[PDB]
Design a protein around this ligand. Sequence first.
Ligand SMILES: N[C@@H](CCC(=O)N[C@@H](CSCc1ccc([N+](=O)[O-])cc1)C(=O)NCC(=O)O)C(=O)O
Ligand SMILES: N[C@@H](CCC(=O)N[C@@H](CSCc1ccc([N+](=O)[O-])cc1)C(=O)NCC(=O)O)C(=O)O
Lengths: 209, 209
Amino acid sequence: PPYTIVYFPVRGRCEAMRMLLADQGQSWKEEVVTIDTWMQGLLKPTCLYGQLPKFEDGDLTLYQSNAILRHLGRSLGLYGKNQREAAQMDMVNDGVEDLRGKYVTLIYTNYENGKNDYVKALPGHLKPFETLLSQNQGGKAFIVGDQISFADYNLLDLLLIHQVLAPGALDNFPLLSAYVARLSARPKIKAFLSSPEHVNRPINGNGKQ
Amino acid sequence: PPYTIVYFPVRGRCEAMRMLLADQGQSWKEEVVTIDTWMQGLLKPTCLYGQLPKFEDGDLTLYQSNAILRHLGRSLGLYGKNQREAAQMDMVNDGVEDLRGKYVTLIYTNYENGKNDYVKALPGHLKPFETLLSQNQGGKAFIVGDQISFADYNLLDLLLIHQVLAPGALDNFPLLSAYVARLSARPKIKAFLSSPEHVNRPINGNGKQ
Ligand SMILES: N[C@@H](CCC(=O)N[C@@H](CSCc1ccc([N+](=O)[O-])cc1)C(=O)NCC(=O)O)C(=O)O
Ligand SMILES: N[C@@H](CCC(=O)N[C@@H](CSCc1ccc([N+](=O)[O-])cc1)C(=O)NCC(=O)O)C(=O)O
């Protein structure tokens, strides 16, 4: 700490890290970058890869959302109890990222002509996570192990935005449905998902969801 | 150990982990999966996300090429000396993965009409790495710190395949140019690059590069 999130005024690739920080009783500063400011092209060239979010943790400045998540997981003790779990958490998080990428592509470049197809192939992309849960404590714990990890927050966010994209998304996924509800009931999470900062923030930059 | 790699008969997303292993004096098993076999539909359904590569350390089965790289780097001591370096290495690796995905799309779905534009935009995508190096001992050491990390093997592979795609891609990037020469000059790595299993193996599965 202190923690500072530099991002556009949307949930997008930052809602997961915010739930993590909130569920760990951490406070952070939000630096909102409007599209107008970004179009001026002043901040963009200063970003390592020309993109946001940008994260500041004390003297450390990071880019790449997944790198930020892993940093928080490693520093706040949300990365498993050993190398074996750490590897499994990375495997889970990479899967989460692959789906988010496709979700993003759908939202921003082909929403009206590709939603039906996307929702059609969605169960196939969610099944792996249902399987993962079934293999861990029968699915009554977390995605990996008995302790919540950064992967959980990223996966939770992914599942939540897909339930908005497709209402009955988890109908045929009992473990994932109970998983989402279980984590959403976590006091700090419930409070976060209920806060105005979160409610007032649109899921994506084009309003589509 | 023992290490087993289940992948297609290409370098693709496994050449990086392969150089890493070889450079660490490690040996492994190569289970080559041909297109024909893959189209038989027996292995795919058994893969966590329906894709390869698949990895086996003996008791632990992994998927996601970056999870594998991170796992090897973590268990073999190639993940930095502290939390700060590990975070920056992740930031590096994420950036490498971002460009690899675009590289992959070009080669497999739009090589002909997209190469011109891709190579034109390539300098802008490599610059960040040139910059990172200039901020780490003038680029005399590694991508992050002075110790080789899983991130270095991934970046090296990325730079090498782009050198074949666009000769002179590093003409305006002296630090990256040297970076590649040096690491490729490493005894274990140099031996790998000259091995028949590597030499005979195509970069991609569609004969393009
Ligand atoms: N791999 C990187 C990917 C980052 C990325 O896609 N960043 C986008 C924003 S998230 C998606 C997004 C886009 C636009 C808005 N908006 O409000 O206008 C919000 C979110 C960006 O910086 N775009 C600016 C640019 O490239 O010039 C990561 O995971 O952090
Ligand atoms: N995020 C995953 C992505 C894995 C991925 O894209 N895997 C591809 C192979 S690498 C790219 C590739 C494609 C084809 C060949 N080939 O020889 O025909 C080789 C490599 C795959 O399994 N495709 C099968 C499928 O989706 O059905 C990772 O990083 O490991």
